[PDB]
Design a protein around this ligand. Structure first.
Ligand SMILES: Nc1ncnc2c1ncn2[C@@H]1O[C@H](COP(=O)(O)OP(=O)(O)OP(=O)(O)O)[C@@H](O)[C@H]1O
Lengths: 62, 396, 55, 393
């Protein structure tokens, strides 16, 4: 009896342990696309600046 | 890494496919290759099959791997793809004796994925990329994802994809694609043609088709200032037409809005839903027709805008006339708006943005392939580690 | 121009197969299909580009 | 860790959620009901059913797939539903991939009956390579990192309360209140009917309305009173003699008729109160049937099933507020208040996932989670041998 409960207790312990592991390990789909969003925004900062400088270059060319 | 000229972006579609091997380095340009999505199949003794670019001896069958955006014969599809890849290999090899000393060396592959493909479909495709075409750099982007970059990156937005026999409805929240809400309508540009044929049953189908393509065809809300106008046929004939040139679009549009409403009504976080409604993106060849996008917006607007119902608003005003604070509602949308285009791509500005989804892919492509990490794509290593399953490690 | 050899020249590796697999601790009385590291016609011609170019 | 992936199917009482273990979000979610057409034709799919509703064809009928116990009802139709998913949403033969399904906690009485039927479906009809079934509230607690938890399922088709002690579903303490989402939907419909134009094919239309504007209403118009509305009202009147937000109006457009509906705050609160004071619904209900006392009952019964003092401190510090209905603003706090009333001597610790999406599909996510563990053998995986054994004499 006692050990049967202990078995169950450790079984669910290991279940939780695998779950909490994956909570930090997984890095879910949403995490990727969210970071891409951020990434993209900074790219668009460059888009704006670089295009402006490309225009500027042309203006300086003549 | 990576050579601009070696980055291959392929965009499949129910009709043709866009291929653009190599980037323009300085700027972005419109894909120059366009190949009909068809391949021939020869039935040999006991059903053995071959594939052909043409109809060998008039015995091969016409196969169309993609139907309504969905792969219906993956064997044929990968054969089609194979043909394309080797076509451009031989093209450049003939054009450049030293092609394998440079541009045909390390070739990045970006394939645009239509959402309807199954999990198993995708696996098989990646299998052929690495085990048939032996390509050591694979990205299979969600088509909708690509679109969200093109519109100066949006967090909450909608993608309306107008096809020829189908239209896809996609909602993006927090940059993620809500797959359980994503759907599709069995209607597209062809339905316009169908209704135009119904409208003018005495016309040749080609007259109708070429008219659809023609600048005289328009969705309304200076050829609009004339009762009649003309258009030159494929055969050089002068086609004269009345206001029928502004007809045949509402059926499509109405059905689009039906699903748009139903789909967006299922977004859980209403705060985000409100944001989604202010960023609507419209893509597809048919959407190039002038006024189309505006009409679609308008239809969506009049059928979903939360605003004190006409007369009731006037009753507030009526009683005032004898200032009324804004009659706020707990519902949404209160603002319906189309997303803003980037003004930093002259080439695309000039071409129009009906194919802008490719641009979005191009933009993110240089973002990915000039980056020091390989975080978002399958390498030969990763492929060796997981097999086809590697795709869900990098899944977007 | 043999397209297959062009492939062998381009981009210059364990293959997998989709097949049945039995779970084990030991082996369990059931099987399922998956991508297994495996045991270890074509289009026949080449498409004439220039016909498929936007010009 | 392991070379596998799987199909997860959650036959909820209202939504059927299904998808692949590979992804964070479900492949699709469809109504746990279908349209029968006549020869025999079965319609599944959110939009498909909506389109069927738009058709309004005589003879179309709505049938649910899940009964009041949270168990499969029309087993032949169940076959058709899963078949539908395998062909159109998952798009894979049921024979290739593994299948994990779930069910709500019960008192154990129907366990064997249900498994027999599932073995018939899974093996005799679909040839599913391997089969497993798990308990939903258990899975939820586990996904929360809890070994012990008081699961409060504020969902549709009743309110489930499941005391979990040391990874044990206390079946004797598990209760299933008849009140929940569906009930409120009924009340909303009935209360708003006075402002709507006129005040079985009809029932197919009821489903339509339930799936559309009713759901929209409840998503934002309902709100849960912080305190007991009755006492709170009195309180404000006292304070008035000594501001009272109950007179504040809220607006909602009745889309299909294009008209503004206006309710005061108190009325919104009145709907919420039905889950706490069902005796205000009618003379067929007892004060003990409110969530407050139901919870207390299940807590106490849990204590009875095993050191009450410790049991109470355990359950009351591992409270999980979940279920779709729990998203009604203020619900969480009200639960806390009810708990402090009936257990003023215990410190309360509750949990609630702030992301709306996560709660809506949390049961599925729980199943998803369990389906993703590396120690394969932990589950009670079933095969044809179990079907055989069952049928062996
Ligand atoms: N925004 C919302 N806020 C609160 N409740 C909602 C909201 N939208 C829908 N609901 C209710 O949630 C119900 C579905 O929730 P849920 O899936 O938790 O119930 P269920 O899972 O079918 O019940 P069970 O958990 O017994 O299967 C719908 O019937 C609807 O009435």
């Amino acid at each position: 009896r006692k050990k049967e409960r202990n078995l169950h207790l450790q079984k669910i312990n290991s279940i939780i342990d695998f779950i909490k592991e994956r909570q930090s390990e997984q890095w879910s789909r949403q995490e990727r696309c969210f970071q891409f969003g951020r990434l993209g925004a900074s790219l668009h900062n460059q888009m704006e600046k670089d295009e402006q400088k490309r225009i500027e270059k042309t203006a300086k060319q003549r | 890494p990576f050579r601009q000229d070696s980055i291959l972006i392929i965009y499949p579609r129910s009709q043709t496919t866009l291929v653009q091997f190599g980037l323009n380095e300085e700027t972005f340009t419109v894909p120059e290759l366009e190949i009909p999505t068809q391949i021939y199949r020869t039935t040999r003794q006991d059903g053995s099959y071959t594939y052909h670019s043409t109809n060998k001896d008039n015995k091969a069958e016409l196969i169309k791997p993609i139907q309504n955006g969905e792969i219906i014969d993956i064997s044929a599809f990968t054969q089609f793809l194979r043909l394309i890849f080797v076509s451009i290999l031989s093209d450049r090899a003939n054009k450049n004796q030293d092609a394998f000393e440079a541009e045909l060396s390390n070739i990045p592959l970006l394939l645009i994925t239509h959402h309807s493909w199954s999990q198993s479909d995708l696996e098989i495709i990646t299998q052929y990329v690495f085990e048939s075409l032996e390509i050591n750099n694979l990205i299979q982007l969600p088509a909708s994802l690509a679109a969200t970059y093109s519109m100066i990156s949006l967090q909450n937005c909608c993608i309306i994809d107008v096809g020829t026999h189908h239209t896809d409805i996609i909602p993006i929240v927090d940059y993620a694609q809500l797959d359980h809400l994503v759907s599709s309508i069995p209607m597209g540009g062809q339905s316009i043609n169908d209704s135009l044929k119904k409208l003018l049953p005495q016309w040749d189908d080609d007259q109708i088709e070429s008219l659809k393509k023609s600048p005289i065809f328009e969705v309304l809300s200076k050829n609009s200032d004339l009762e009649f106008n003309t258009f030159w046929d494929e055969k050089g004939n002068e086609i004269k037409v009345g206001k029928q040139r502004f007809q045949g679009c509402n059926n499509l549009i109405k059905n689009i809005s039906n699903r748009v409403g139903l789909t967006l009504d299922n977004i859980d976080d209403i705060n985000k839903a409100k944001a989604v409604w202010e960023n609507i993106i419209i893509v597809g060849g048919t959407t190039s027709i002038s006024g189309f996008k505006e009409a679609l917006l308008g239809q969506l607007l009049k059928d979903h805008l939360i605003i004190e119902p006409e007369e009731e608003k006037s009753k507030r005003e009526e009683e005032a006339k004898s200032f009324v604070p804004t009659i706020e509602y707990v519902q949404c949308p209160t603002v319906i708006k189309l997303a803003k285009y980037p003004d930093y791509f002259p080439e695309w500005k000039k071409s129009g943005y009906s194919e802008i989804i490719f641009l979005g892919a191009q933009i993110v492509s240089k973002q990915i392939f000039t980056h020091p990490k390989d975080t978002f794509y399958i390498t030969r290593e990763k492929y060796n580690m997981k097999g086809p399953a590697a795709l869900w490690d990098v899944q977007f | 121009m043999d397209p297959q050899t062009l492939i062998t020249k381009a981009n210059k590796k364990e293959s997998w197969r989709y097949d049945w697999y039995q779970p084990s601790k030991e082996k369990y009385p059931f099987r399922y299909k998956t991508w297994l590291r495996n045991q270890e016609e074509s289009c026949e011609d080449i498409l004439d580009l220039k016909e498929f170019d936007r010009r | 860790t392991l070379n596998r992936k799987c199909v997860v199917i959650h036959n909820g009482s209202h939504r059927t959620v299904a998808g692949f273990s590979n992804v964070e979000l479900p492949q699709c979610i469809i109504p746990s009901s279908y349209i029968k057409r006549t020869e025999a034709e079965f319609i599944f799919g959110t939009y498909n059913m909506i389109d069927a509703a738009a058709e309004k064809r005589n003879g179309d009928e709505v049938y649910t797939l899940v009964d009041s116990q949270g168990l499969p009802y029309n087993w032949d139709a169940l076959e058709m539903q899963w078949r539908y998913l395998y062909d159109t949403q998952l798009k894979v033969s049921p024979e290739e991939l593994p299948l994990v399904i779930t069910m709500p906690a019960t008192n154990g009485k129907p366990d064997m009956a249900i498994l027999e039927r599932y073995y018939e479906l899974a093996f005799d009809k679909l040839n599913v390579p391997v089969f497993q079934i798990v308990i939903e509230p258990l899975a939820i607690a586990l996904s929360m990192g809890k070994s012990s938890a008081f699961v409060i399922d504020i969902g549709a088709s009743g309110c489930n309360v499941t005391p979990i002690i040391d990874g044990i579903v206390v079946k004797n303490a598990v209760v299933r209140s008849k009140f929940g989402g569906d009930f409120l939907d009924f009340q909303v419909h009935e209360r708003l009917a006075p402002l709507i134009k006129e005040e079985q094919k009809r029932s197919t239309d009821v489903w339509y309305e339930a799936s559309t504007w009713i759901q929209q209403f409840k998503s934002t118009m309902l709100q849960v009173s912080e305190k007991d509305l009755f006492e709170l009202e009195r309180y404000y009147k006292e304070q008035a003699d000594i501001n009272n937000p109950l007179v504040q109006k809220k607006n909602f457009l009745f889309k299909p008729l294009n008209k503004t509906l206006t309710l005061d705050l108190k009325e919104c609160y009145q709907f919420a109160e039905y889950l706490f004071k069902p005796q205000l619904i009618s003379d067929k209900f007892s004060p003990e049937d409110g969530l407050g006392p139901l919870m207390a009952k299940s807590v106490k019964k849990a204590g009875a099933s095993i050191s009450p003092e410790q049991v109470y401190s355990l359950l009351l510090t591992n409270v999980i507020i979940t279920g779709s209905t729990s998203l009604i603003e203020g619900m969480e706090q009200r639960i806390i208040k009810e708990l402090s009333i009936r257990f003023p001597q215990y410190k309360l610790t509750t949990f609630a996932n702030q992301v709306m999406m996560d709660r809506k599909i949390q049961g599925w996510l729980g199943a998803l989670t369990m389906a993703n563990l590396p120690s394969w053998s932990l589950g009670k995986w079933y095969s044809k041998e179990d079907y055989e054994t069952l049928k062996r004499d």
